[PDB]
C-alpha cells in the first residue's frame, strides 16, 4: 500500500510542548494522524483492497503485491469526530449520518511530527502533562491517552510508502494479530507485542493508570494498574468529588528514576492531579504512585518499561466503548460506581451520543517544568 | 495441511447418550478431539509450518501450498490434561513439565462421532444434561461446556484432509480472526462468526448461562446471560450453598419452543439443577429461565439461536484462565465472591495447580428423558 | 439389624448398560453398595453391636433381638476408597488417616438396582463387558469383578430391614461362615455356599478367569481357572505385552450355550480382550475359552454354573491384598512374574499406597452387542 | 457339652521324653487326643447337637444350654487313621469305608498328659527332637508337627467338662472363627488368635519351618518361614537328596536365647537334620537358622514367640491336603518340585490313598541332650 490520490491526507494540527526546568515550554509543530485501519484503500481501478477489515486476496496475496497494488487514501477528520484548535484535541465517539442517526466513529490518533514521523516521546525520568474534559464521557466510555512502543515511521518499507503519515504500524500490550503487522501485510499471522504505558484510561466516573512491560514475545496483559476507586477511595475521582470530573482538571505523570535523571532506571510512576490552579492532594497518603509492579515481574518488571520509555514511544489518543463487557473492568463493580448494564454502548448512544473527550495543552519535559 | 505420521491421532473415547421420552437413553460411540491449534504441524523434512501460532510463509504462502506441504500430527491427550473413563471427561489446566514445574495446558475439545465428523447436537426444543465437578476450579478458572455452530467436518476441503479428526474449523460469537479460518489458511484475514450457546461457563465460585445470536457478519458478543450472583442471589450457587459446588451436581438445560416441539421457534432457555437425586429449587421464582434476550435483538434475538440449534451444533469442552482480566467478568465484582486479584493465573498456579474439570454422563434428548 | 439414622446411606451412582443385538445399549440407573461388614452398627443408646467383627452377645443373643436392637448405619464411600463418575468406578486399597499414615480400606461393592435390590445379572448364553485400568495394581493386589449367587434382597427378613441397601447376604464358593449368614445372625454357625463366577481376578502382572460350580452343601473351591501365564504364555498379559496392562483394555466374557441361546445349557466360557479399538488375538490358538471344567465335575460341572447364571447373579466389585500368602497363587511362582516376597501388603503399602482399580463402562447383553 | 457315654474316650498311648544334659532322657506317660471337631455330640435323646459343623440352634442356643444339653462322645482312633506303638505315632490321610472306597479322615492330635491336660511344652532356650517318615506323603500332602498356644485344659469351664480329654480349645496363627471358641460355644462369633510355632510342615518333596508371633488381637499369618527349596537349595531336601526323604530322618529344632538359657529372650531358631546316625550338613553355610523374622515385627518379632514358648505350648500332630490350592504354597512353584496340578487331593486319593505320616521318638529338653 502507498499514498492515495482521491483524498489527500491533511493532518489536523495540534500544538504540543517540550518544557525544560530552565527554558520554559517550547511550542511544537505537531499534529494528529488517524490509525491505518480507519482509511479507505484500493487498486488503480478502484476495487477495494479490504474486505470487512481483512484484505482482498486477489489484490492482496502477498506483500510485494499490495505494495504495488493498493493505495490508502486520507480521511475527513471532522467526519471522523476529530478536531483541533491550537493546543486542543476533541474526539467524538459518534457522528451523525446521511443514512441513519449516529454511526460510531472511534478515532485512534497518533502524535505526528513535522518530518512525517511519530513524535518519539522519551519520558524516562521525566513528565508528561495535559488537561482533560471527561465531563462528556459517561459510564462505559473510555477516554484514552497512552504511549505505545511503535516504529517511528510506522514500519514503512519498500511496499509501504504511507508509513506514519497514514497511521501505519500500531501495537500495544494486548499483542494484537493484525492485517497489517508493522507496515507489512501480516502474511505470517503473528501478533504484535510492544510496550504500552497507559497514562489516562477512563471516563467521568472512574479512571486508571496502568503500565504494561514487555518481552519481544509477550506482554503483561493485566497491568499493575492503579484505580482510586478500586483501591478503596470511592469518593476521590468523580462528579463533584475531590478531583471533580465535571470540570477540567490536569493530569501530571512523572516517571521517577533511581539516579533521579533520564540517564536511567525506572523506579516509580507518580501521579498528581491539579484543578483550578491549586494542587489536588493524593488519594493514598505519601503520593499516588506505582512503586512495585508485581504482574510485570515475568517481563522485567519496571526495568523494561523504563528502557522502553528511554528508547522513545509514540503517543496515542483514543476514545472507545466496549460492546462486549461494557468497559465494566474500568468503571463498574469494585472499580467504579457504574452498574453492570449502564455501560452498554447502545444505551450510551441512546442517552448521550454527544460524548467526546477534549485533550488540551499536551506538554512533556523535565519534572516540574511542564507545571 | 493433511494428517501426519509421527504421532497418530487416537481419540480418547467418551460415552454420551441420546434419550427419548419412551425408549430411555442409548449409548453413543463418541469421543473427544483436541483443537487444531494445539497440534504439531510440519513439512516432509520436519521444518515447522507454524511460527508462534502463525504460519511459516515459505511453507505456507497460500492455501494450495500448505495443503500439499504441511501435516498436522496427533497429540498425547494425557500430556494435554485430557482423560476419559467411560462416560467421564477430566480436563486439567496445567501439567507437570520435564523442564520447569507446571506448564499451562488448556484443552479445547470437540465431541467427535464414529464417522469422523463432529456430533451434530440438535437441541432445539430439547434438553442437554450432564454432571460437573467444579470443586477443583477456584476463582479465576473457567470450566466450559458450550455449543458452537462449526462445520461438521471442520471445513475440510481439498487442502485440508485432517478436518474434524484434528479439530479443524473452530468459531464462536467472539468472531475470532484465525490462522486457519474454517479449514483454510485464512489468506483474507477475516474473522469467523458463528452462533455460540454457552451452557456452562464457570468455576466453584460462580457460573453463567449465556446465549449468543448471530448474523452471517457478526454476533452478540455481550450475551444476554444469567448469573444467579449477578441477579442478586449471592447465596445460591457456591461452596456449601443451595447448589453446593463442593460436590457434584447436575446441570439440565432445556430449550423451549412455542409449539413445544423440535418442529420450531425457540422461546426460552430453562435451567434446572439437581444434586443428590433431589431436584434443587430455582434461584428466582417461577424458574431460572432466559426468556427475553435484549442484546440479541440486533441479530434476530432468540429466533436465530433456535434456527441454529435446529441446523445442528458442535459440542465444545474447555477450561482456561484469563491472564488479562482474571475472568473477573465471571466470578468477581458484582458477579462473584472472588476479589479482583484472586483470579490471577500465576496465583492459581501457585495455590492450586491441580485444578481440573470433570464432565460426566453427557446425554441429550427429549425433555425429561435424560432426567 | 435395621437402617440407622446417624449416617444416611447414599449409594454412589454407577451407570451400567444392557445391550441387545438390535437395539444397542441402554443406560441403567444402577449404583454400588458397600458390604454389610464394613458398616457401623449399634443399639438406640449407641453401644456397638459388634465386637471385632463378631457380635455383642448382650445386644445380639439371638436374631429377633438384634433385629429389634441394632441399626446398621451408612458409610462415607469416599473415605472408603470408593468413587464413581458416570459409568466409572474407582476403588482404592488404602486411604490416608487422621491418626497414622494409610489405613487399608478394602471395598467390596455390589451393583444395586433402582428398586433397592441387587441387579440380577442373567449372563447365561450372553456376555458381560467392561474396561479396566490395572496399571495401579502391582504384585500382590487383587482387582476383582465376579458374580455371586446372592439373594437379590440380601436375605432381608423380619429382623433385617436393611437388606441389599446395606450389602446384606454375601457369599461365594469359599463357603464362608459369617456373623450374618444370609441376612440373619448366623446362630447355627453354618457356612454359606453359593455359585461364584470369577470373571476378572488379578493385577497388572497377571490375571485369572475362574468358574466355581456348587451344590447346596459345597462348592468347587479350587476352580478350573485359566491364567495365560500359568498355561505357558508368559509374555501375553503384562506391562508392555500383547494385552499391555500399563494402559486400559477391555475384558469380554461370553457364556456359550449348546442351543446358542439363553434358553439353556452352558458349554464354554469364552474370553476375548481388545485394546485401542483393535481386537487382541487369543493366547492359545482357537480361542481363550474354558471348555472342560474337570474340578467342577463333583458339583455338576458347568451344568450347575449355567443354571446359576440363568437364575440370576449379583455383581461384586472388590480389591484386596493377601496378608497370608501375598496372593502368590495369582501372580507368583508358575502363575506370575512376581517373586514370593514382592506381594507382601506391607511392601505394597510402602512402595505404592496409591493402588486402585478403575472399572469403567460395564455393559452386559447379547453376544457382540456390548461390543 | 460334657463327656458322653456311648463311646468312651480311650487315649492312644504315645511315649515321649524329657532330656536333661546330665540325666539323659526320661519316659513320659503321654498320649494323643483327637480334636474336638471330629467327635460325635448329642443330647440325652440322641438328636445331634451339630449341623454340618455348626450347632443345632434348639439344643445349642447359648452356652449354658449345650453345657447342660450336649455330650461329646469319644472316637475310634484306628478308624480315624490314628495309631500308636510305644514311642511311635502313625497318621493316615484316608481310611477305607463301609460305603464307598476311601473317606478322607484327617486327624489333628494333641499331646495329652497323665493328669488329663495338654502337655505344656516349654521350649524356650531348649530343643524338641523327633523322627519322621515322610516317604508316604507325596506332592500335596501336609505332614505337620507344630506348637499352638492353647489353654492346657482346652478352656474347659462350667459348661464344658470335656476339656483337653476331648481336644477342646484349638487355635493357631490363622485366627480361626470356630463353633467352639476356647471351650465355649462361640456366641460372639470371634476368631481365636494364639501363637503358633510350625516346626515340621511338609511332605516327601519339600518342607518348611515357620514361626508365627502374636498379639492378643492378631498374628503373623504369613510367617517368616524357611524352605531350603525356596531359599534356592533345590537339591537338599528330597527323595535321594542330601536329607533324603525316602528314608527316616531326624528333625532337631533348637530355640536359642541371648542368655543361652531358658531364663529368657529368643534370638534364633536353629534347624539341624541328621540321618543314619551321621549329622547332615546345613543347606546354607553357618547353619539353617531363623535369625531375623521381618514379618513378625508388627507383633513383637521373636520377642513374643519366645515369651510364648516360655509360658508353655501344646503340641499338635496333623496331616491334611488342600482342596483349594493343593498345598502349592508348600511344595510347588518356587518352593517345591511339585507341579501346580500334582497336589490335587482327588489325584492323591487316586494314586496313593495309603499316605501316612509316622512321627517317632518325640523328646524335648536341654540342647544336645535329646541328641
Ligand atoms: C476483490 O478484487 C477483485 C479483483 O480486483 C474484485 O473483482 C472484487 O470485487 C474485490 N472485492 C471487493 C470486496 O472489493
Ligand atoms: C517494524 O518494521 C521496521 C522496518 O524496518 C523495523 O525497523 C522494525 O524493527 C520492525 N519492528 C518489529 C517489532 O519487527
Ligand atoms: C520456515 O521454513 C523454512 C524452509 O522450510 C525453514 O528454513 C525455517 O526454519 C522455517 N521456520 C521455522 C520457525 O521452522
Ligand atoms: C466452511 O467450509 C466448508 C467447505 O465446504 C463450507 O461448506 C462451509 O459453509 C464453510 N463455512 C463458512 C462459514 O464459510
Ligand atoms: C456390649 O453391650 C453392652 C450392653 O449394651 C455394653 O455395656 C458393652 O459396652 C457392649 N460392648 C461393646 C464392645 O460395645
Ligand atoms: C436367604 O434368605 C431368604 C429369606 O427369605 C431366602 O429366600 C433365601 O432362600 C435364603 N438363601 C438361602 C441359601 O437359604
Ligand atoms: C435339632 O434338634 C431338634 C430338637 O432336638 C431335632 O428335632 C432336630 O432333628 C435336630 N437337628 C439335627 C440335624 O439333628
Ligand atoms: C480360655 O478359657 C479359659 C477359661 O478359664 C481361660 O482361662 C483362658 O484365658 C481363655 N483363653 C482366652 C484366649 O480367652
Curated annotation (Swiss-Prot), chains A, B, C, D:
Class of enzymatic activity (EC top level): hydrolase
Disulfide bridges in this chain: 19-25, 49-70, 60-66, 139-338, 171-194, 175-193, 214-219, 224-293
EC numbers for this chain: 3.2.1.4
GO biological process: cellulose catabolic process
Main location: secreted
Protein purpose: Endoglucanase (EG) that cleaves the internal beta-1,4-glucosidic bonds in cellulose. The degradation of cellulose involves an interplay between different cellulolytic enzymes. Hydrolysis starts with EGs, which cut internal glycosidic linkages to reduce the polymerization degree of the substrate and creates new chain ends for exocellobiohydrolases (CBHs). The CBH release the disaccharide cellobiose from the non-reducing end of the cellulose polymer chain. Finally, beta-1,4-glucosidases hydrolyze the cellobiose and other short cello-oligosaccharides into glucose units.
Descriptive protein name: Endoglucanase EG-1
Organism for this UniProt entry: Hypocrea jecorina (Trichoderma reesei)
Top-level taxonomy: Eukaryota, Fungi, Dikarya, Ascomycota, Pezizomycotina
Residues of the full protein shown: 24 to 393 of 459
